[PDB]
Nucleic acid binder design. Structure first.
Lengths: 429, 84, 49, 50, 99, 49
DNA sequence: CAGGCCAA
DNA sequence: CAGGCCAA
DNA sequence: CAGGCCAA
DNA sequence: CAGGCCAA
């Protein structure tokens, strides 16, 4: 029989988009100096071990796509980031010929020059670390002497403005020529810092374990041999990275009296759970099903996360475990591996009189060429004849929310807990 | 020399969309009858020869794509119809 | 098209499009409704819906 | 056959909307570095470039 | 650089570069005043083809900036040459050559 | 038809100073650098009598 | 082209 | 044997 | 990857 | 030697 009709199904349009950027970064060869961080509120007193390995913010959307691209992508509901790849090439590493201390003849033609590469240090359960901006001494510009108050949000915002510049109506427009237009180098200021407990004021049983041997977890090469060579090549497939929420479905509550029905989930977990842990061991690990959350499209939608655009530079691209879909789903926790590259500090040719680390360093810069590609996909489903696009209600998305109404999102800024990136309340920009 | 930059040009995203419909039409076998049409303004007086050949409106956008598709396509500036 | 870094999509000015307009401001468009003239479909003023 | 100093350089322009009244265009600059070639000049010594 | 509005010229921002213009589109680039004066005595003269070949030599970079308050002198150099063909004709890059 | 000669611009990218700036931005000090370009040019003309 | 969603 | 004419 | 637009 | 621990 001639089939006059056949189940061709819905009309769905899938769009794949690619975002590419090229960035040139200058990195300081910061010395390895212990800095004291005083206790503040819930933060204990700790020792900080500074490094010269600059953080590469490849986990954020501004790294791959310009404000124009971001604004246009906003008009594509259902957009998911598919894969993010970054390639880092280092160029000739400059080392100061002399320290500038006139009282010594330390100038020399010879250089020992090492490049440090750190993949996934952020996820190591026992190396408590985060990326920090330092303040430096005037006599020794390469020696950290404290911490800048610049937060991670402010750092990434400043880096974005250096990448793309100001708006034409900005009075400060001339200050930052866009590196996306010029191709000029950008100074990085956000470096890996290793922390350990400070037991000087600790009462009771002190932990006196020193630092973890973090140099056993990084790669280091002779930077003289690495000129114009690829040093980092990492791809990442996103588990769940909703950049724009799905098209809202036609609400079945307007058609059906069964919208609030119940059905068996069996032994499968179709609702995600939040795990709370306590490294102080005052409380056992806790798993709580049905965390507070609300839809990011539909009649009672709360789109604060996507209207505050947390996902451009404040919050990492991948948010697996933060977002639920209303269907039989498998959801796991997610992390993007951290990338830190830098030059080891070059000691001065002075001769110190004691068996210890060098106390004076030559100025040295790492020159890193960064190639980054981001792939995204969006959908245009037509479940209904009129009224525009509508998705299936099984494509409805929820986002974890705090009880005060602030969206909860993954953050890569704080140190890991048991190798996990925490979920934290988003802050209104 | 290692080309650190090359003229990759602009970022342009091209989207191709397809619109399909299936319609079933009933046509009357109209007789061939001469009808008089009186002159009206600039229109002269003329004789009309009727036929039963129904017009197929395949030259118009509603023939291929629904109001939902039309409303969504409105949000894609630069859209050209390629082939029908 | 992304000719510029910020502000959204912008095309090249060579992609700018003009449409024929009548002197009263009504857009002119092709119509297949009237009989052909020398085998040509006419252009006529559009009527406001 | 002596060298001559050139003084005439490519300049990229964009609108200044600080005093613009009405709908402002805030598109920044065009990414002009996506339209030029760049090479390591250390490797280009005594080489044809144009 | 800011360029103030002047008459018909609007207020605009200028992004300076180091890419020097090569005036290969003009007759003085190829032929001397003596040749020009003699060519004047050949009516019906059309320029047929103009070819230019550009070779770059060693690129010099200053060893130090001269700021005595810093020890910025270094043996190491990152050194890049920029080549731009046909930027003037790009419809959306509004540019010109400036001193 | 309309005509255009393609533009030629060559130059050296500015070389940043080895100083360490305290903010995430472009370099604010540059070393002096010169490009040395050898230009060979040929012009062919024809005339008639 | 069906069975816990389909645009997987 | 259709799309700026067909008797081209 | 240039010469009357490029996303042809 | 990276992505929910590594000593699996």
């Amino acid at each position: 029989a001639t089939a006059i009709l056949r189940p061709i199904g819905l009309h769905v349009e899938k769009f794949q988009q690619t975002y590419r950027k090229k960035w040139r970064f200058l990195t300081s060869a910061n010395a390895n100096v212990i800095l004291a961080e005083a206790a503040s509120g819930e933060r204990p007193a700790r020792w900080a071990l500074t490094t010269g390995m600059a953080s590469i913010p490849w986990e954020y959307l501004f790294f791959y796509m310009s404000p124009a691209e971001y604004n246009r992508m906003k008009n594509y509901p259902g957009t998911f980031a598919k894969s993010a790849s970054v390639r880092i090439r280092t160029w000739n590493t400059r080392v100061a010929f002399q320290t500038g201390d006139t009282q010594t003849a330390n100038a020399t033609l010879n250089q020992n020059k090492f490049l440090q590469v750190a993949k996934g240090i952020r996820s190591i359960p026992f190396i408590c670390s985060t990326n920090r901006k330092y303040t430096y001494s005037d006599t020794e510009p390469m020696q950290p002497t404290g911490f800048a108050t610049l937060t991670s949000y402010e750092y990434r915002d400043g880096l974005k403005i250096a990448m793309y510049g100001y708006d034409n109506d900005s009075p400060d427009f001339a200050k930052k020529p866009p590196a996306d237009a010029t191709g000029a180098e950008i100074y990085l200021q956000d470096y890996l810092t290793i922390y350990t407990n400070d037991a000087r004021a600790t009462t009771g049983t002190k932990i006196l374990a020193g630092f973890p041997p973090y140099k056993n977890f990084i790669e280091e090469f002779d930077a003289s041999a690495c000129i114009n060579t690829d040093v980092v090549a990492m791809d990442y497939d996103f588990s769940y990275a909703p950049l724009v929420p799905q098209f809202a479905p036609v609400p079945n509550n307007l058609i059906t009296q069964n919208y609030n029905a119940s059905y068996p989930a069996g032994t499968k977990n179709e609702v995600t759970a939040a795990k709370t842990t306590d490294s102080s061991q005052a409380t056992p690990p806790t798993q709580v099903r049905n965390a507070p959350r609300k839809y990011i499209q539909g009649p009672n939608a709360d789109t604060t996360f996507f209207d505050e655009e947390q996902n451009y530079l404040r919050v990492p691209i991948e948010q697996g475990g933060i977002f639920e879909e209303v269907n039989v789903e498998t959801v796991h926790d997610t992390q993007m591996p951290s990338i830190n590259v830098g030059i080891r500090a070059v000691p001065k040719l002075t001769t110190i009189d004691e068996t210890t680390q060098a106390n004076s360093w030559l100025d040295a810069q790492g020159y890193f060429e960064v190639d980054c590609v981001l792939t995204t996909e969006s959908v245009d489903p037509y479940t209904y004849i009129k009224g525009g696009c509508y998705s299936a209600n099984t494509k409805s998305q929820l986002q974890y929310f705090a009880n005060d109404g602030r969206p909860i999102a993954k953050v890569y800024d704080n140190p890991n807990v048991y190798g996990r990136m925490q979920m934290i309340k988003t802050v209104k920009p």
